[PDB]
Symmetry: C3
Subunit: 227 residues, 3 copies
């Protein structure tokens, strides 16, 4: 078993034989229920893009837990110079860790790392296809709709986290299209409600996406499911 | 209705209930029929990439008109520090403005901003899918042929602006392919003849693209069409 | 005819009426059999991405041979300030040189240029579709599996160089998917064995890709074939 907790915005916590957190935007995440000290012992940290609402508190969390950060080469290079343990990958590349397999997926976005007020190159934005004990979790990251998502149809993803808030990411209508592409067994909506710019009709999403035979599990920040 | 004017290179001016200019490359544009002072009152500025031939005179125009620039997060960040009103979005993300809906489409290109002789990160390049009064304008920006363009097929675009210059963008041959993928009501070729590096056979493009059943409207810099 | 030599990692040398090298990662390439002096006269240099293992010795090699580097705008701008002859292009752009035609194909990766310890923006990473005397060579570049590779299917590529190392690039399983997408005449695995992280069952690749009906040519660093 494993307990997958959604902590608001794009934050996803996987508790299993190892503890993995994706896009640990915790401090300054208005809709996140916990502080940094509310997190359990963290073994791995997955970062999809350099943006603050994704990179977030990775630097601190990594150091306090002696955790290792998995992201693209440009983001890891940055983190490395902050004295942070990393495992560099890049888009479409997989690797088998002690806990399972992690694959960086394509995504449409900017991966700019904001340092002070200078925009540093942080490679290209990604998602994550995580295979743990046969189960498969897809974290899309911040992304628009892309045809590269159709590649995941044969993976038979169990739980997929998709953005729905629009403006910066897929809106509700597009996120449904994305779910038909991926055809996961279950979908969880993310990137919404954090600000007013990305308010979304999460009820409508669940309705439309279940017409397409995909179960929608609307997790409020703090709620979770298991695999 | 509305008046869509092509001002050379990738510059497209939409005159409706509000005024919008896409990729305002005015000063320095050898084929642009107008000076900066020629432009009517600008309400919004759409910037597809951080490049000079797209960003262009955005900062000046923005300030003179108290206009808001719509672009990706990284470009809007750089613009903000130059004291410019911005509405940030990113690839595949749409939003509803007072004049209509704007959506950043994917594009295969670079988005470097040239501030000094330093090359700054400007996120990832895009196009724009603009929905005004039930009409849809697709502005591809600078881009090669991409499969993401097929996502636009079902939009039933009214006018599509595609590059044909080659070298930095699609050549005539690939731009025909893009036109068939999108199947718009009409296609207008852009990014050609600005330099001798991109002196392309615009007449041949028209012939070839119309053999595929896609009406072409060749617009000389300064000419326009209505919706 | 022409002699196409693989020199480890992503280094491919094309000897014909002109001499073109792709991603000249020679110094510090443990699987590259030659020193810089082992190279013939270079007329052209093809750089897919800004990464060290691709940009390689392009600056030094260019200066010695008075060669021109073919890469994207952001990369060519950098090399320009190093006093290096460049012909800038970008993704999807083709151009006809004296030796033949070069097109920058899409690729899913990063393209950061590492100056000292600064990660400079080097645009977006690419592949290359080179056509010399009716022959077609696809150098994928460093990349994951993307649907953009299906745009190459109708080219009837004679020889395609695809990465199989995993982690940073496609693994063996995904590279076979990419090969069926492209459907070329021959396929040559690259980006493997250079480090411990990217050891890959090269033999298994050949077996599996030829099961799908695409002849595989395992070239070891220094081996070559003809067209
Ligand atoms: Mn953002
Ligand atoms: Mn350009
Ligand atoms: Mn690399």
């Amino acid at each position: 078993g494993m307990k997958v907790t959604f902590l608001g915005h794009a934050v996803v916590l996987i508790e299993g034989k190892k503890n993995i957190i994706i896009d640990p935007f915790i401090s300054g995440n208005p809709v996140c229920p916990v502080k940094l000290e509310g997190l359990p012992k963290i073994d791995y940290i997955l970062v999809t893009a350099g943006h603050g609402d994704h990179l977030g508190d990775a630097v601190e969390i990594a150091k306090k837990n002696d955790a290792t950060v998995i992201s693209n080469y440009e983001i890891c290079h940055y983190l490395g110079k902050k004295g942070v343990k990393t495992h560099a990958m890049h888009i479409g590349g997989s690797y088998l860790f002690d806990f399972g397999r992690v694959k960086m997926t394509p995504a449409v976005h900017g991966s700019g790392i904001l340092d002070g007020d200078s925009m540093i190159y942080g490679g290209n934005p990604s998602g994550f296809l995580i295979t743990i004990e046969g189960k498969k979790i897809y974290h899309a990251g911040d992304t628009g709709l892309t045809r590269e998502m159709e590649l995941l149809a044969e993976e038979n993803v169990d739980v997929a986290f998709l953005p729905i808030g629009g403006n910066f990411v897929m809106d509700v209508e597009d996120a449904v299209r994305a779910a038909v592409m991926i055809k996961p067994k279950k979908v969880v909506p993310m990137h919404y409600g954090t600000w007013e710019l990305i308010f979304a009709d999460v009820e409508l999403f669940k309705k439309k996406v279940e017409e397409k035979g995909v179960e929608c599990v609307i997790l409020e920040p703090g709620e979770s499911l298991e695999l």
